[PDB]
mmCIF file of C-alpha atoms (C1' of nucleotides) in Angstrom:
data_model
loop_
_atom_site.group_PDB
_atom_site.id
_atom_site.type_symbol
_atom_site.label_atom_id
_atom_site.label_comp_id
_atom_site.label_asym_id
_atom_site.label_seq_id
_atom_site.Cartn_x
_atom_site.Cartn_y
_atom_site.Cartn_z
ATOM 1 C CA UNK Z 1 -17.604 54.440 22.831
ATOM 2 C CA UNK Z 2 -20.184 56.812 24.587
ATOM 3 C CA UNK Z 3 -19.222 59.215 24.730
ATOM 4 C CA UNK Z 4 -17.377 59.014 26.872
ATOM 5 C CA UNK Z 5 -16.054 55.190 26.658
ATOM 6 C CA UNK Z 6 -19.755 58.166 20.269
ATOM 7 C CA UNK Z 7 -21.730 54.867 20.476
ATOM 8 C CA UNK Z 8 -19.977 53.468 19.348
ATOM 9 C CA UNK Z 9 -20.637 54.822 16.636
ATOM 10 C CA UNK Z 10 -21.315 58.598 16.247
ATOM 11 C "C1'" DG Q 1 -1.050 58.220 27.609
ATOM 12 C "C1'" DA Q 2 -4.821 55.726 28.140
ATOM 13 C "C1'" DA Q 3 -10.010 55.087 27.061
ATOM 14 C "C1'" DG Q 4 -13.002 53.721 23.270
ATOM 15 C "C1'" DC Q 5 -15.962 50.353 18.713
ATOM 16 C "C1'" DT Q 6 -19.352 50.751 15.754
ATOM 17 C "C1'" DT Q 7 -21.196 53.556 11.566
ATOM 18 C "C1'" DC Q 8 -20.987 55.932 6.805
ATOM 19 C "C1'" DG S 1 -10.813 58.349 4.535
ATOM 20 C "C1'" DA S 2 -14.268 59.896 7.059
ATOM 21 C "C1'" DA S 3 -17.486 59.731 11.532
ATOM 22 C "C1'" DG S 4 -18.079 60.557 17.091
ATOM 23 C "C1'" DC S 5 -16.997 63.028 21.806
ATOM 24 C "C1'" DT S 6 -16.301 62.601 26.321
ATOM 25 C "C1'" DT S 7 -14.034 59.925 30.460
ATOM 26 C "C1'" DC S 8 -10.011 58.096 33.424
#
DNA sequence: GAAGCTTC
DNA sequence: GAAGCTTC
């Protein structure tokens, strides 16, 4: 997730 | 080491 | 299997 914490995604 | 799910 | 990097 994020980032941080991609997306998600990406 | 945990923290981090939604896409292509 | 690849695709997403930055936080705590």
């Amino acid at each position: 997730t994020x980032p941080g914490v991609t997306x998600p995604g990406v």
